[PDB]
Amino acid sequence: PQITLWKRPLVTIKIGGQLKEALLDTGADDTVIEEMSLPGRWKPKMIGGIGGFIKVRQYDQIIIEICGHKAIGTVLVGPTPVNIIGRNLLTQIGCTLNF
Amino acid sequence: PQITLWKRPLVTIKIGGQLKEALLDTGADDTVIEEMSLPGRWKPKMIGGIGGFIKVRQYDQIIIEICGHKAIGTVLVGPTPVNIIGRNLLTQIGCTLNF
Ligand SMILES: CC(C)[C@H]1Cc2cc(F)ccc2S(=O)(=O)N(C[C@@H](O)[C@H](Cc2ccccc2)NC(=O)O[C@H]2CCOC2)C1
Ligand SMILES: [Cl-]
Ligand SMILES: [Cl-]
Ligand SMILES: [Cl-]
């Protein structure tokens, strides 16, 4: 699809068999989702944003579908204000910016 | 142009007679720039991001040039860790997400 930016670029994602709303975010290096249960071991990570940082849990090789496009990669879990799909997964789905 | 997302989508902007590097950020509703002088009236605003909120000065009707594309809109000025071009200006240059 071609998504304009007059409203937030919110899409439906599927992770752990559950549908969630998330923001396609070119300004985010990484994908960070609100608290949920994911399988396997996690590693520590810090993410810096506008008003400071949040500590997150890094899960690797997680199956996630974004607007019907299947991806497998790193998902961070933590106290983010919104679910964010960052560049690590936007590249997997072949997303570009165009003007 | 077509901008891939293998690295941060940084571009040169011209604002307030200065050249700055800024991130094309679909996840940002607003444009926020590091401390600089801008002409005209301003009012205070709080903006939230992953790590809480920052206080900024809101300047309206500011002309920016992004990749040879001129636009006008509100620009927020404050202690952002990165200069961000948000949706309010991305729409004006005809920027879309494509996959
Ligand atoms: C509604 C929310 C989404 C947005 C809230 C928001 C709203 C605005 F009107 C302007 C800025 C921002 S924000 O900068 O706080 N941000 C945009 C994100 O794209 C930031 C931009 C940024 C980059 C680097 C340093 C500071 C800010 N990325 C961000 O927080 O990336 C983290 C998240 C995962 O990867 C790293 C989140
Ligand atoms: Cl990844
Ligand atoms: Cl505006
Ligand atoms: Cl349009």
CA distance B36 to B15: 10
Q: Is B29 a catalytic residue?
A: no
Shortest distance, CA A64 to any CA of chain B (angstroms):
16
Q: What kind of experiment solved this structure?
A: X-ray
Q: Which ligand is nearest to the CA of B86?
A: 1
Buried b (16+ CB within 10 A) or exposed e, B3-29: bebeebbebebebbeeeeebbbbbbbe
Ligand 2 centroid vs B43 CA: distance in angstroms?
40
CA nearest to B3, candidates A63, A91, A31 = A91
Q: Which tokens in the block code for residue A46? A: 């810090």
CA distance B41 to A33: 38
Neighbours of A34 (CB within 10 A): 14
CA distance B50 to B71: 27
Ordered domains of chain A (ranges, CATH): 1-99 (2.40.70.10)
CA distance A64 to A17: 9
Q: Which tokens in the block code for residue A53? A: 């940082």
Resolution as reported, in Å: 1.2
Q: Which of A13, A29, A50 to mutate to test the interface with B (most CBs of B within 10 A)?
A: A50
Alpha helical stretches, state H, chain B: 87-90
Ligand 4 centroid vs B69 CA: distance in angstroms?
14
Sheet of strand A2-3: strand arrangement: A2-3, B96-98, A96-98, B2-3
Which residues place a Cβ less than 5 A from the ion ligand 2? Answer: A 73-74, 88
Residue of A nearest to B98 (CA): A2
